[PDB]
Each structure stands twice: as C-alpha cells, then as structure tokens.
C-alpha cells in the first residue's frame, strides 16, 4: 500500500540525504553508513517495483545515486559486503546488475539532462567498480565455483560502455574537451577494468569464451584509439586460451561467431579502415610473440582483414552508388 507515498517518501528521502551531504552540519560517516546499511537493498527493491517509467521514478533514481554518491567505499566494504549467508548477497548482486541494465536501457531522462546524466554515469562507474573488487575478493577462484554471474556484469559493463561515444562529444568542438576536463574519458578506465577482470579471471576463461565473444567487439569497435589499442590483445589472449583447449580441438568455433558478429556490426557501420589496420598490426605483433599457431591465426586474420576492407568498401560505395 506504499504507492501514494512514493513521491512523498522520495521527498523525505531526498532532503535527509542531502542535508547529510550538507557539509559542516555534522560528521555523519557512521550515520550515513547506518542509513545505507538499512536502506540500500530496500530502495533497490522499491525501484525494482517502482520500476514503472511514467511516474516520478526519476526522482528515486537521483535518490539512489545520491546516496551512493555521498557514500564511500569503506561503507560498501563495511557490511553491505559483510552480509549473512553468501548466496543471499549473491542474489542481491544479481538484483543490482539486472537493475543497472534496466537503467542504462530505457534511460529515465530525455537526454537533455546530460549533466546529471554524466554524474550518474560516474556514480555507476564507482559503484560497479566496488562491485568488481568485491566480486574478485569474494568471487574469484578463491570462490572458485558459481562464477557465471559475470555474464550479466560483462554485458552490463559493455552495455554501459555502449553510449556517449566520439561522435557524441563531437557535437561542439568544445564538447569533447568540456566533458574531458569535467570527467575525462570514462570509456578508458571502463574498458581497462573489464580488461583486468578478464585477466584476473584465470583458467576458467575457457568456460566462458563463446558467450563473451560478442561483448569484446564493441569495446574493440570503439572509435577511440588507445583503449582499443589495449583492447585488441584480448583477442589473441582468448584465442590462445582456446589453444590451451585446442590441445583438444581448435578455435574454429571461436572464430566463427567472431567473424559473424564482426560482420553484422562492421556492416552496421562502427569501425573504420584504421581500425582494421591497427587490428592487423597488433594481432601480428602478438603473433610474433608466439610460435606456429600465431602464424595460423595470422593467415586467419588476413582473411578477416580482407573481409574488413570488403565491408568498408561496401559501406562507402553503397552510401554513394546504389
């Protein structure tokens, strides 16, 4: 029966936290700590159910982030880390990620509040980061089993990283620099964190490739240079992992959907010629790092690259010939 109170509650919920954020009124680290402790999963449940889009849900949105905006890692790690039986906290985390995907998908703003938009981007960065560290120190091969959940994470991570791109900052010549000075390039460390999570995964990667094949391309498809630069080697990485498998088998299964998706997005029109160029380059580098199977992957990547100029030429010609 909480329904009519939602907005009203948010009102309450608003002011408290913001007067908590009000600087010199009084020290509140433990106080906000407590409020966190006994309201987080709660409000998350709410906006799970409050998840209807038409109403004042957006307000709750701010509420949530504001909390965690104010609220510091020491707290995340404090007891929201330190819950009861682990499986419960696992459940909670799935709730978190699924909701985050539900946020980034169907964003609750008309894209004109891009300022607070950037802010909530940042706070989501921070929060999911804290989730990353706990998921390591509570769900790496130290928690060797029940390690699928990253599915969500990774897609969510990728799904996060799949907006606010070079053309977007292009809008004003100032726009890029503006958002960089205020924020930098979020995508950089976003992808880097996903990358180090990949590395941190360890041997269980082989359990995971065919799924994560899709995600690693958009990030690689990224218009920018540098993170894409650090991003390609992952490809040689899991192809090598598939080789650790290919001791029994190959990586043909891998390269198949590789090529597949590669197509549908390249024809979808994201990468550029220099994209394939640097692909070729770096993959070749990696192939110099390794022996014979690197040469095999080289000829396969030559096939790839070929297909790439085929597609780019296709695109440029279609947009101008019929």
Curated annotation (Swiss-Prot):
Which protein are we looking at? Dedicator of cytokinesis protein 5
Description of how the protein assembles with itself and partners: Interacts with CRK and CRKL. Interacts (via N-terminus) with tensin TNS3 (via N-terminus); the interaction increases DOCK5 guanine nucleotide exchange activity towards Rac. Interacts with ELMO1.
Of which family is this protein a member? Belongs to the DOCK family.
Q: What does this protein do?
A: Guanine nucleotide exchange factor (GEF) for Rho and Rac. GEF proteins activate small GTPases by exchanging bound GDP for free GTP. Along with DOCK1, mediates CRK/CRKL regulation of epithelial and endothelial cell spreading and migration on type IV collagen.
Q: Tell what the record comments on domains.
A: The DOCKER domain may mediate some GEF activity.
Q: Where in the cell is it found?
A: Cytoplasm; Cell membrane; Cell projection, Podosome
User: Source organism's superkingdom?
Assistant: Eukaryota
